[PDB]
Structures are given as structure tokens and as C-alpha cells.
């Protein structure tokens, strides 16, 4: 009658299975405007950027 196992297992699988699929993707790669948005997301968050400063203060 207790649902705690679902709440725990949700985080447990969200960590473990995602790490496992990342490792599996790396193994498949070994066996075998994205840059623009990546740099944009990296330039919002910074120690020098005011937007990153207010973002970390807010979080």
C-alpha cells in the first residue's frame, strides 16, 4: 500500500539507464545548427555574463 518504491526507482532508472545508454552510444561510435545553439546555451551561463550571474542567483 506504499508507493515509495516507484518514486525511488524513477530517479534510480533516470540515472542508471541514461548513463548506460550514453556508454552504449559511445561504444557504438567506437565500433563504427547544433554548434550555434550549443555555443548560445554556453554563453548564457558564464561567470562573466550578467545573465549567467542572475541565473545562478535566482536558482
What is the C-alpha separation between 16 and 49, in angstroms, rounded? Answer: 34
Residue with cell 525511488: 8
Residue pair 46/52 in contact by the 8 Å Cβ criterion? yes
Contact (CB, 8 A) for 43 and 37? no
In angstroms, the CA 7 to CA 22 distance is 23
Cα 3 to Cα 10: distance, rounded to the nearest angstrom:
11
* Three-class DSSP labels, the chain: CCCHHHHHHHHHHHHHHHHHHHHHHHHHHHHCCHHHHHHHHHHHCCCCCHHHHHHHHHC
Establish how many alpha carbons lie within 13 A of residue 52's alpha carbon, considering only the half-sphere containing its beta carbon. Answer: 10
Question: Using CA atoms, how far apart are residues 17 and 25, in angstroms rounded to an integer?
Answer: 12
Amino acid at each position: 500500500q506504499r508507493m515509495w518504491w516507484a518514486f525511488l526507482a524513477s530517479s534510480m532508472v533516470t540515472f542508471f539507464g541514461g548513463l548506460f545508454i550514453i556508454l552504449l552510444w559511445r561504444t557504438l561510435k567506437y565500433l563504427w545548427w547544433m554548434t550555434s545553439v550549443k555555443d548560445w546555451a554556453g554563453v548564457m551561463i558564464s561567470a562573466q555574463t550578467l545573465t549567467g550571474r542572475v541565473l545562478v542567483v535566482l536558482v
